[PDB]
Amino acid sequence: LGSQKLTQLRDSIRCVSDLQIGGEFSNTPDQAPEHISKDLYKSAFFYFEGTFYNDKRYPECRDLSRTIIEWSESHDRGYGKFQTARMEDFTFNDLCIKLGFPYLYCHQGDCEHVIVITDIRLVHHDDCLDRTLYPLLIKKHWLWTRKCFVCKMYTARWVTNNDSFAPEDPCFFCDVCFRMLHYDSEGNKLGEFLAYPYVDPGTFN
DNA sequence: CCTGCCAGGTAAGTATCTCTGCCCCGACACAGCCTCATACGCCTCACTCTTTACACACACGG
Ligand SMILES: [Zn+2]
Ligand SMILES: [Zn+2]
């Protein structure tokens, strides 16, 4: 919406980089997920027409745009001049943008999201007209779902590397069999493996 | 212990090239401008058969 106040679009974009509980569980089969990446690294920014808009809300945030400026001032590699804003006071229709032209949304540091604007049209009925649900993700890709590699009847809850039983190196196991190729009879490691929690983005967001 | 003329056979002759040193050279670098010509390279696009996933359907059989 043209008054939706960015940091509202930001808080609503359903990516899976706002998931993926970190940490390696190689000796902890049953571990409480302490913090999803959404909670930990709340910093993010929108790049729009030279200017940056940094999510300065949530003072556990930081300035991800800063880094870029650091090498646009020294050793100019294209891109000339740059600017930065706060993204919190700024709402939509406060910008000076092009349509159909790629712009950036970087959240969680390295996930990059292109923010092409398809078209600006005035409000008209035959739509919701609501405000609560208004960001309104109306299309999504229906991605593929990574299933377990031992059995094919469940999804990939666990990703293991350097395993001692996995044919492939990054091997995706459902929780059932993951508990059965490792962690035997007391929940103690078998062989060697680095097991990380997998979110299976075909399922989420 | 040598020495030689004649017949027969043969034969002419005419008629109808591969190195090898060696002086007197072209083409290398490389300088700016400059215009158009040629080559390379790299990522974005296409597509195409062949699976790949996934909601749904439909007998099937006793
Ligand atoms: Zn993301
Ligand atoms: Zn399994």
Swiss-Prot record:
Subcellular location: Nucleus
Chief location bin: nucleus
Ranges in a coiled coil: none
Annotated GO MF terms: bent DNA binding; DNA binding; RNA polymerase III general transcription initiation factor activity; RNA polymerase III type 3 promoter sequence-specific DNA binding
Keyword Metal-binding attributed: no
GO terms under biological process: snRNA transcription; snRNA transcription by RNA polymerase II; snRNA transcription by RNA polymerase III; transcription by RNA polymerase II; transcription by RNA polymerase III
Keyword vocabulary terms for this entry: DNA-binding, Nucleus, Transcription, Transcription regulation
Record bears the keyword Nucleus: yes
GO CC terms, sorted: nuclear body; nucleolus; nucleoplasm; nucleus; snRNA-activating protein complex
Subunit structure: Part of the SNAPc complex composed of 5 subunits: SNAPC1, SNAPC2, SNAPC3, SNAPC4 and SNAPC5. SNAPC3 interacts with SNAPC1.
Function, as annotated: Part of the SNAPc complex required for the transcription of both RNA polymerase II and III small-nuclear RNA genes. Binds to the proximal sequence element (PSE), a non-TATA-box basal promoter element common to these 2 types of genes. Recruits TBP and BRF2 to the U6 snRNA TATA box.
Family: Belongs to the SNAPC3/SRD2 family.
Name used for this protein in its record: snRNA-activating protein complex subunit 3
Source species: Homo sapiens
Gene designation: SNAPC3
Range within the parent protein: 207 to 411 of 411
